[PDB]
């Protein structure tokens, strides 16, 4: 199993998500943010991969945010650069399997973190 | 695990042909190769086989076979090293980056070899008898130290920067 | 005696060098045969100065 913790939450501009992962990342190689807020349904926010460091970012946030990773401390971060008030949300860190299907389905994932609200 | 991908780019185009006009899409990926195997299993090697060689200056100058072996051992390390190498991969005939590096320490490692016989020339053939011997040792334990320390500076400086 | 070891030390790592891909990063077996060479490469600095001093 894979145990994700999130820091970087509270009301807001620009600010920093972070999530820290313990356990068998091997086998999860890829980590994904998400957000979920009342009445709508949970979002893919991007993508990092453990020693690979490529992304992919969803098209509201593209050019706005990024991600990036600490392999040795194993730590996923996403710059939350010029938010805007519709991003407030609770943001997810997620795990994906090596086999699992798309990046932007929630579904494929398994271990999730807790999740940091955000108010903008 | 060579490489990881900094890009991949979509095109579309016409291709002509004798036969007529065809449709292309490319799909195309930007390679660049992790150095980490390489500074493990071949660069370091290198560099200690070329450390190697500088025991020889504090070695006695009358013990001339000790000073023989450990060149000569030097410089047939750094031959098998470099011919190992190239089985490896295509036989393409110009020289790459690594080849330049160990033709490098093959001068130097042989230059060392060069120097013993200088100074064993000058110590049992041709001040000269007594002092220019233990002289050249002296220059030598950090010319050459210093002087393959500013070849391997400026190599990384070209290939890496530039 | 010493450089026949260095170049026996070296002669390992060419064998594994073939039997696994071409990783970048340090294995556990890496980090051994790497303290092995030390070891055996100090062994050869041990007379480099030993040999110094006395003759000197
Ligand atoms: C790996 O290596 C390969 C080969 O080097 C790379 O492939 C090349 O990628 C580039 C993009 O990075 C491609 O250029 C684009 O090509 C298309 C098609 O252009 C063709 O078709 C047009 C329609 O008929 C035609 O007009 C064009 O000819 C005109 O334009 C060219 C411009 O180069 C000019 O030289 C000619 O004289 C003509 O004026 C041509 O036949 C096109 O859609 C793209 O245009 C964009 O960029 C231009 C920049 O000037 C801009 O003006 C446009 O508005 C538009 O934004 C662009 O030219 C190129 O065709 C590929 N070459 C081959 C041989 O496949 C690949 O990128 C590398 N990959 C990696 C990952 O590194």
């Known amino acids: 199993q894979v145990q994700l913790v999130e820091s970087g939450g509270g009301l807001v501009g620009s600010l920093r998500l972070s999530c820290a992962a313990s356990?068998?990342?091997?086998?999860?190689?890829?980590m994904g943010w998400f957000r979920q807020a009342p009445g709508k349904e949970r979002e893919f926010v991007g993508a990092?991969?453990?020693?690979?460091?490529?992304?992919s970012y969803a098209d509201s946030v593209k050019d706005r945010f990024t991600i990036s990773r600490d392999n040795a401390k194993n730590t996923v971060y996403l710059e939350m650069n010029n938010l805007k008030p519709e991003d407030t949300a609770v943001y997810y860190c997620?795990?994906?399997?090596?086999?699992?299907?798309?990046?932007?389905?929630?579904?494929?994932?398994?271990?999730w973190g807790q999740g940091t609200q955000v108010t903008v | 695990p060579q490489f990881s991908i900094v890009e991949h780019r979509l095109v579309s185009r016409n291709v002509v042909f004798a036969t007529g006009a065809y449709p292309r899409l490319s799909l195309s990926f930007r390679l660049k190769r992790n150095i980490g195997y390489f500074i493990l299993q071949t660069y370091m090697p290198s560099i200690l086989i070329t450390i190697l060689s500088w025991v020889s200056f504090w070695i006695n100058y009358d013990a001339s076979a000790a000073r023989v072996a450990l060149g000569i051992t030097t410089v047939l390390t750094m031959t098998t090293i470099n011919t190992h190498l190239r089985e490896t991969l295509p036989k393409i005939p110009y020289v790459k980056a690594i080849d330049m590096y160990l033709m490098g320490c093959f001068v130097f490692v042989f230059l060392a070899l060069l120097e013993y016989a200088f100074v064993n020339y000058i110590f049992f053939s041709q001040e000269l008898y007594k002092g220019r011997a233990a002289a050249i040792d002296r220059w030598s334990r950090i010319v050459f130290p210093f002087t393959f320390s500013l070849f391997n500076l400026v190599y990384w400086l070209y290939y890496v920067n530039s | 005696l010493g450089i026949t070891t260095v170049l026996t030390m070296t002669t390992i790592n060419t064998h594994l060098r073939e039997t696994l891909p071409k990783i970048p990063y340090v294995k556990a077996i890496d980090m051994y045969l790497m303290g092995c060479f030390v070891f055996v490469f100090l062994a050869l600095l041990e007379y480099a100065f030993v040999n110094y001093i006395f003759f000197s």
């Open positions: 356990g068998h990342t091997f086998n999860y190689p890829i």
């Open positions: 990092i991969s453990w020693s690979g460091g490529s992304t």
């Open positions: 997620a795990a994906k399997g090596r086999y699992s299907g798309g990046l932007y389905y929630p579904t494929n994932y398994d271990y």
